[PDB]
Amino acid sequence: GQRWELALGRFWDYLRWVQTLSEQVQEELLSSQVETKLNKLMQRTMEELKAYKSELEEQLTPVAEETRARLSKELQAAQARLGADMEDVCGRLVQYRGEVQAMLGQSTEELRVRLATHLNKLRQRLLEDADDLQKRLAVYQ
């Protein structure tokens, strides 16, 4: 398991707890603690990923520059897909905080159900985009 995969694993571990939407989660969500921690976990994932990309590129047996730039761009695509998935996670959690803050004490049940439905979809993308990224990195080296 590469460093970036472990970093993504810590992102997953925290996201999974957040999705329970317990009252403890709601506490740390409305205090912006959740969006702060998820942002850091996301950044460390992308940083490790960037550095790990540079690693494989240097150990790559030389090839025609055209293929070199294509595989590079193919990996930036998968790299960008993962990044967008995580950013979207943080976003919907920020949005939820803003909505509750504007709800003046009414029931957040329906908001939490819609949030869970959206996190489940974003979650599905991260599995897919992360898997494709792992495959494209392996064939790389």
Numbering used by the authors: 19 to 159
Article excerpt on this structure:
As the sole target of neutralizing antibodies, the virion surface protein Env encodes a glycan shield to restrict the antibody access to antigenically conserved sites. Small protein mimics of the CONEs are designed by epitope transplantation and used as immunogens to focus the antibody response. Here we focus our protein design efforts on four CONEs, including the structural elements of β sheet 12/13/22 (CONE 1), α2 helix (CONE 2), loop C (CONE 4), and loop E (CONE 5).
The C2S5 scaffold is built on a four-helix bundle from apolipoprotein E3. The two helixes used to display the CONE 2 residues were well matched to the α2 helix in terms of the Cα-Cβ orientations. For instance, a discontinuous three β-strand motif was grafted onto CONE 1 scaffolds, while the two helixes on the CONE 2 and scaffold 5 design (C2S5, a similar nomenclature is followed for all designed proteins) displayed the α2 helix-specific residues. Comparison with the Env trimer protein revealed a high degree of mimicry: within the epitope region, the Cα RMSDs between the designed proteins and Env were 0.42 Å (C2S5) and 0.34 Å (C4S3), respectively, suggesting that our CONE mimetics accurately display the Env residues. We selected the most stable designs (C1S1, C2S5, and C4S3) for immunization experiments and further structural analysis. The CONE 1, 2, and 4 proteins were monomeric in solution, while the C5S3 design displayed rapid exchange between monomeric and dimeric states. No HIV-specific antibodies were obtained after immunization with CONE 2 (α2 helix).
